[PDB]
């Protein structure tokens, strides 16, 4: 019908802008992770020695790996900011609200998109050029040992829903347009866009997974799970900042983390 | 949020 049509157009437009915005999609990451591709398999990093050999193809070691994640996050935030600008009506909002939405959104979307790069065994890094084992990351000296295990725990549950790129494009758009972010000045227009996106996501989940039973409802439960993971992550960062003085926090990360949960 | 402002304005 005509209301359906508009929601299908929005799903198509978000998907396009997702493909442009993000270098490594879930499709490629799956292809690389299965091995069922013609491309060169990724350099596996399972220990200190493998990490050192790995440097070429892609300070204490733990700190080296934390700075790695730091550079990667900053790139993710830039890709996600370009993607938010694609979300119809997002740029038309109050700039201070645009900032507030991204400020609380980016880490939730980073963890959502990290799952596409993850399996129970490890995570693809440097655009699938590397593959860092979960056991290796777990093994790091505290507090760095428990930095990524929560993201692995979430990713195995979230990966069960077998969402595809077209589902994810709308799902991340719905996360960005959250009306309950602290300090928003004009909630109504944000809620109006989220209502359009949520209907678009509902249709997309019925169409793309017609066999799937209340995928849309399970997916909305995961959004509340994501907030809890983003809080815990800020706690460890709060800890790491104070405990390690050899650690420099990237300015862009500082803007986001400043006055957050 | 000058960097965020900058990225949003770019």
Author numbering:
A (entry chain A): 205 to 262, 275 to 477
B (entry chain B): 687 to 696
Sentences from the paper on this structure:
To reduce the effect of Arg288 on ligand binding, we generated the PPARγ R288A mutant LBD construct and could resolve the imatinib-bound PPARγ R288A mutant LBD structure. We observed that PPARγ LBD was flexible in the H2–β1 loop, the region around the Ω loop, and the H11–H12 loop due to the inherent characteristics of PPARγ LBD. We found that the distance between the Cδ atom of Ile341 and the Cδ atom of Leu255 changed from 6.9 Å in the ligand-free states to 6.3 Å in the imatinib-bound structure.
PPARγ forms a heterodimer with retinoid X receptors (RXRs), recruits coactivators, and then binds to the cognate peroxisome proliferative response elements on target genes. Through this process, PPARγ regulates the transcription of target genes, which plays an important role in adipocyte differentiation, lipid metabolism, glucose homeostasis, insulin sensitization, and inflammation. Compared with other nuclear receptors, PPARγ contains a considerably larger Y-shaped ligand-binding pocket (LBP) with a volume of 1300–1440 Å3 and is known to be activated by numerous endogenous and synthetic ligands.
